[PDB]
């Protein structure tokens, strides 16, 4: 679809789409850029993430509204429409996972890029898990856990405790534990140790990195305040 457009033009248009709040376009442009087969820069990885996070975020919010209405109802229309939204959401998740598997992850040698992509893999299996009920919920959950876990292992070995990707990964793995895996103590433990180890590393940072790191620490704090 985007095969005839230059990689640089796709990136340029992804940035324009972001400015215009056109996130479905943004995602299509970044999918096209990925499919050119070259590795993505830090900025380009963030564009990919922003685009699909916003697309799937709208779908998740809609699915939750419909699922709640469906539950309250204990005709077939509510179920049909929830299924329609669910199938669209699963399709987006499948597309992202397909990009990671073909071939972003295998070509990511650096810790920064490999952790970023493995976090994404965990996130999009997590979104699949939120709507899963069939013979594959358990396998979907374990796929999310495995991706998050490999990202955690690399990030702990290769990144400082205040690195924003490491922090955002730990935040989301903690949400996985609490919301998906029915492991609230694991969730609380991870959020707390991540928060404390970041705090102890802030003294090494510039004013700019300090702001970057403390922003995500605030989200860890917010969840601990919700959970304890």
């Amino acid at each position: 679809a985007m095969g005839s457009m230059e990689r640089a033009s796709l990136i340029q248009k992804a940035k324009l789409a972001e400015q215009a709040e056109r996130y479905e376009d943004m995602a299509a442009f970044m999918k096209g850029a990925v499919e050119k087969g070259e590795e993505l820069s830090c900025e380009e990885r963030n564009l990919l993430s922003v685009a699909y996070k916003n697309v799937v975020g709208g779908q998740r919010a809609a699915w939750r509204v419909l699922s709640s209405i469906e539950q309250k109802s204990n005709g077939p229309e509510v179920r049909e429409y929830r299924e329609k939204v669910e199938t669209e959401l699963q399709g987006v998740c499948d597309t992202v996972l397909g990009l990671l598997d073909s071939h972003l992850i295998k070509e990511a040698g650096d810790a920064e890029s490999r952790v970023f992509y493995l976090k994404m893999k965990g996130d999009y299996y997590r979104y699949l898990a939120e709507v899963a009920t069939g013979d594959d919920k358990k396998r979907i959950i374990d796929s999310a856990r495995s991706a998050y876990q490999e990202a955690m292992d690399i990030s702990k070995k290769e990144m400082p405790p205040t690195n924003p990707i490491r922090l955002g990964l730990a935040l989301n793995f903690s949400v996985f534990h609490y919301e998906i895996a029915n492991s609230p103590e694991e969730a609380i433990s991870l959020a707390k140790t991540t928060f404390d180890e970041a705090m102890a590393d802030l003294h090494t940072l510039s004013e700019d990195s300090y702001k970057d790191s403390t922003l995500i620490m605030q989200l860890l704090r917010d969840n601990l305040t919700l959970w304890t």
Partner: peptide, 6 residues
């Protein structure tokens, strides 16, 4: 709902 990396 808890916060994930917005």
């Amino acid at each position: 709902r808890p916060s994930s990396w917005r």
